[PDB]
Structures are given as structure tokens and as C-alpha cells.
């Protein structure tokens, strides 16, 4: 009932994820468990969550019990900023696997297209913005590329099934795709009727990326985190134009929410975190959003970004 | 007295210049010479522009006369899209050499972050949007930092003083500030009141990157291309924000719209076509814009931007 996508690399890909940001230790584990009994396959997590560990005793537990087998579930994670330097990437990647319990993860992507200065891991893990020294940032001279092709090296050792990028613009994604071998299966953007970035999907689209959408709730993840900008605007599920639309199909504004990138070929990977939320946010490719709809909640695309590193020492990756 | 700019290269760059797009073949001669008895140092120029051959010798004139040495004029030219590629980037800057007659131009950038497929200078030149499959747009997988190192090697070999880029984002650069080994000393860039992009110019002046902006009078140069976003904008002359301002110093609206940049730190370089627009566009230094003055300016800014890959090919260079 949930349908895959076809990965550049030939692997399928869950169009519909489970999120691990702001996934709680404590409780991970039996998170990702209960999603997977719900039907969930794909799991989308991060070095910088720090929860690696649980996601993988959550998948464990599952496949120790019989409910699924490794093949059958997609790990997603990504290599945090610290470890862009080709010699640490393994390093990272490694940290991972270990944390997982899997020999290979299924899509790794470069967090963000920032190398802060490396931080050994015995140090600091995750080590999230600490950079070596007390509260500045402090960068490493890696581009982008050379960080790309230990990507790739590392899908020829058997270490990772598929690679891709996330947060990252038109025109750095366009250089990429000039100097790499294997080209990125993946690029996961902020995606929400608030920022839609049409020329940039379709862009990557036909380059044959695929595109897999966070933050499809907009401000909401980020109002959980009192970020200002997010309190500020209001919110998708009580505009007056995803109602409607919801109203029209007797569905919920949510199921509008991730309909709308659903249709267009956009993967989801929602963050659920009650049972019921779990049922709706994979339940909601009961209907099709029309041409007039599409248009209407065109109009709510304001450029309004969320998750921007400018806020976090003006870095100019969207500027 | 047209202040001049130390560039990061320690080499100084007027901060007021003579722009030479669009310069009739027939009179570029004719108009660098006068500009160069106006009083400009600095000519703008561009392997696209098909007229540096006539742009040398306006200048040449203007030595041969004893007006100026060579050391004193200031020549700016421009890689073009097809001459990315390492191999064919010291043939493409020879060709600028020679026209101009000199042995070096005292600033070579990057013109786009595109790389279109080669065309030899005999098949046609300048080539413009040829790539030499009929009307077909036609590309080369030649990563930035590859064309980057080509020009630094033509740095170290005396043929260029200073090298930059044109028409780069944020991301952009900051992954070419990681591979230069000679950091991009200027960034050119779309400028004026509706595409203000205040974030970029920050971000760059910080790095110590010099902005050099264009189009500084918005639509206009794109209206005189019959362009239908230009037509269909109203003009920052007849803004009643820009008139206001103006009047308010007895200044012309083009004063106001460079002295903007200028008192930012900007270095501007407008297409004088006019005994008295080539006099008052490098006279305007007269006067500062007041705090609450730069507040009215800020609201104009909609991010509407005129010259865009994306309307020749869907290039996501700015998405
Ligand atoms: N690569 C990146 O930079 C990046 C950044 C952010 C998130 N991500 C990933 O993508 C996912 C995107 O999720 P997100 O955390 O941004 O938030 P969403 O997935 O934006 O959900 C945000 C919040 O809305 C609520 N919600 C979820 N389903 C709902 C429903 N059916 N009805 C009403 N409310 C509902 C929950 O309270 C949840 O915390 C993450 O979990 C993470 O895996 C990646
Ligand atoms: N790197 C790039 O991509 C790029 C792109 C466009 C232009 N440029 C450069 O920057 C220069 C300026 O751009 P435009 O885009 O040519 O220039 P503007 O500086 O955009 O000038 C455009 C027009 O305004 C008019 N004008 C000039 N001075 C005036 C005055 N005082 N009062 C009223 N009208 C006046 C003229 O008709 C002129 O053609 C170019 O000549 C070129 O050298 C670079």
C-alpha cells in the first residue's frame, strides 16, 4: 500500500518514511518498533540525532521477532558537518553502522553542504554545532566533491546502497552532479506550502534525483523547538486554504499536507509521535488534489525558510 | 576623485566604472577613449560582449597619446560559458589578451557558474548560447573549482592580476572559498533596489570578497532588450520611494540608485550612454543617504531579478 520509488541507483525507496528528529533516547526504541508493526519501512535518521543506537535496537527487536528481515527495511542516515573531510567520512559512516547494527545503510546523505572543523568522536558524539573550541564555529577547507567521492568509494565497499544530499541549492547540486560518478539518488530539502521551491524540484527532478521532503508540516516542528520565526507564522493545518481543500475531500488538513507533495512524486518521512498520528500520516493517498488545488495552495509559497544555518552563523547556503 | 577599492589580491580597483555591454562595435573605440578623458579607469568588459577587440583600441588610443599608461587603466573581462573547461580556458583568456592588446587584464571572472560545451573561436565568436548542435543548449561536466585552479595558474603566469567569479550564490561560493587556493577576489552580481540580496553582500564582504554590482538601474538595460519581466516592472526612476529621495538632495533618481551601493562599499559600473550620464555616473559621491533613507530603500527589495539562467534553460543557478 506504500508506494516505492525507483532510485537512480536501481534500489526502491518507501515513499513514506518515519522521521527521527526530536525522536527521544529513552523511547526510540520502542518508537520505531510500534512503526514498524503500523507498517513503516523506511527510517529517516541522522548522526546529529544522536539516537542511532535505539533506532537500531528498534529495528532489531523487529527482526528479531520475525516481522521483517534487514532487506526489507530502508535505513536512511547522514553525515554530520564535522566529518566532511574524506579521511573522517568512514570514520562517520562506521559510527553509524556500529550505532545501527547493520552492515550497510540503505541512503546516506550529506547533511548539510557545510564542513565544520572535525571533532574526534571520542571527544564529542554527536557533536551537533560544538566545533573544537568552546562555543565558535571553526570550518575545514573540504569541498563539496572530495567529500562526494568518499561517498562513493564507500558504495563500492558494499558500505552503502545509495548516496544524496540534503540541503543543498540549485547550483551547487548542478556542480555536483558535474564531477560525480554516481550520481545523488537523493535530495532532501525543507519542503512545505510555505517553501515551495518549484524551479529547484523540478530541476532535480528531471535530472532524475529524487526528492524527499522534511519539515511538510511547516513551523510546526520548529514551534516544539520555541524557534521565534516559526511561532510567528501561522500555522498550515488551521490556514484557510488547506481547510478547505481538506473540507472538499473529507480529509484532514494533514492528509492534505503530505497529499500534495505525494502527488508530485515527492517522498515523505512525517514525524509521528502519537499512535494515531502513525495511522494517518501513511493513510492519506486516498484521493487526488486537483489542478485548481494545486494552484490555490501555490499561492501560500512565501520563501519562508525554517531550517536555515544563516541563523545559526550566517552561512550563506540559501543565499 | 573616484575612490578605489584594495582588493583582497592587495591590487586597488576603482570603485566606479565605465560598463561596456551593449557597446556598439562601430563607436566602443570612440566611447572608452572619451570615458577614459571623463576621467573612468576601470572598463568592465566580457569575451561576450564581442567588442573588446574595439574596447583595446580606445584604449591604446588614450595611451598613444599620453593620457594614461597601462598601469593606470583598470580592464575587467569576463570567461565565457563555452571556455570552462581547463584546457581551453588560457585559449579563451589569449583571445581576450589579444583584442585588448595587453598582455594582462587586471580582473578575470568567471562569468556563470555554467559550463557550456566547448566551440572553437573560429567556428564562432563570441559563441553566446551556441553550443554547437544547432539551437541546442549543450553542456560539460567541468566542476567550478577545476575552471577556478585553470585561472590561478594563469594568475601565477602574470597574465591575469586579480580573478573572481559573476553571478555566484552564497552556497556557491563558500564551496569555492574551500578548493581556491587564491581566494575569489571579487563577486559581480545583479544589484539594485529589487534584488537586494543583503545576506549575499554581507556573506561576501566579510570573507573579504569584493562586490561589484550590475544592472544597477534594475529593469532598464533588460527594457532596452525588449525583455517582458523588465517591461512589466515598474522603474526604480520613476519609484515614488527613489523620486522622494532624490528630490530631497536635488540629485537625478540614477544618483541615488548608485550612490546606494556606492556607500555601501559596492563598486558600481554603469553603462554610460551620454556626454552628461558619463559625467554625472562617476560624480554622485556628493552626498549620503540617511539611516531612515536606506529603510525606505530596504522595502523595495522583492527579490525580482532580470538576468536568469533559468529563463535561457531552466539552469537552477538561482534556486
Ligand atoms: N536533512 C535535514 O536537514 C532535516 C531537517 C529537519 C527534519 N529532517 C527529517 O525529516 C523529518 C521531518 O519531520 P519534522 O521533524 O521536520 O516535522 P513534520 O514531520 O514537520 O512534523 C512536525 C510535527 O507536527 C506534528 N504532526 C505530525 N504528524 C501530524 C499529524 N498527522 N497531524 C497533526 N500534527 C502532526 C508532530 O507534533 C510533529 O512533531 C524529521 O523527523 C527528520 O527525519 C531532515
Ligand atoms: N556579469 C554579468 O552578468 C553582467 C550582466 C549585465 C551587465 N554587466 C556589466 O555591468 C554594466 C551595467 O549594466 P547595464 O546592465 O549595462 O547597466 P545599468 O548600469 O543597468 O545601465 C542600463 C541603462 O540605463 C541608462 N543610464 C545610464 N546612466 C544613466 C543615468 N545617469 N540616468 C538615466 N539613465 C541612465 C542607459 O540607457 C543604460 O543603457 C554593463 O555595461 C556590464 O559591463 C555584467
Not at 186 to 201: A, F, N, R
Not at 297 to 317: E, H, M, S, T
Amino acid at each position: 500500500s506504500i508506494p516505492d520509488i525507483k532510485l537512480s541507483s536501481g534500489h526502491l525507496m518507501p515513499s513514506i518514511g518515519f522521521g527521527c528528529w526530536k525522536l527521544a533516547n529513552a523511547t526510540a526504541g520502542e518508537q520505531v518498533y510500534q512503526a514498524i508493526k503500523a507498517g513503516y519501512r523506511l527510517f529517516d535518521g541522522a548522526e546529529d540525532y544522536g539516537n542511532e543506537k535505539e533506532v537500531g535496537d528498534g529495528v532489531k527487536r523487529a527482526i528479531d521477532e520475525g516481522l521483517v528481515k534487514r532487506e526489507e527495511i530502508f535505513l536512511t542516515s547522514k553525515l554530520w558537518n564535522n566529518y566532511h573531510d574524506p579521511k573522517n567520512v568512514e570514520t562517520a559512516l562506521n559510527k553509524t553502522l556500529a550505532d545501527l547494527k547493520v552492515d550497510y545503510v540503505d541512503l546516506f546523505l550529506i547533511h548539510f553542504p557545510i564542513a565544520f572543523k572535525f571533532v574526534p568522536i571520542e571527544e564529542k558524539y554527536p557533536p551537533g554545532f560544538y566545533c573544537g573550541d568552546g562555543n565558535n564555529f571553526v570550518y575545514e577547507d573540504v569541498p563539496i566533491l572530495e567529500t562526494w567521492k568518499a561517498l562513493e568509494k564507500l558504495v563500492a565497499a558494499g558500505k552503502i546502497k545509495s548516496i544524496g544530499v540534503s540541503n543543498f541549492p540549485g547550483a551547487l547540486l548542478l556542480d555536483l552532479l558535474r564531477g560525480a560518478t554516481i550520481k545523488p539518488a537523493v535530495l532532501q530539502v525543507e519542503h512545505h506550502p510555505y517553501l515551495q521551491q518549484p524551479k529547484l524540484i523540478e530541476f532535480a527532478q528531471k535530472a532524475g534525483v529524487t526528492i524527499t521532503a522534511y519539515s511538510s508540516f511547516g513551523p510546526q516542528s520548529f514551534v516544539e523547538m520555541n524557534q521565534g520565526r516559526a511561532l510567528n507564522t501561522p500555522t498550515l493545518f488551521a490556514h484557510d486554504t488547506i481547510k478547505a481543500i481538506a473540507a472538499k475531500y473529507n480529509k484532514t488538513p494533514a492528509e492534505v499536507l503530505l497529499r500534495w507533495a505525494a502527488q508530485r512524486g515527492i517522498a515523505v518521512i512525517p514525524r509521528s509521535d502519537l499512535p494515531e498520528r502513525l495511522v494517518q500520516n501513511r493513510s492519506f493517498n486516498t484521493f487526488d488534489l486537483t489542478k485548481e488545488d494545486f494552484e490555490e495552495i501555490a499561492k501560500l509559497d512565501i520563501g519562508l525558510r525554517f531550517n536555515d544555518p544563516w541563523d545559526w552563523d550566517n552561512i550563506p547556503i540559501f543565499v
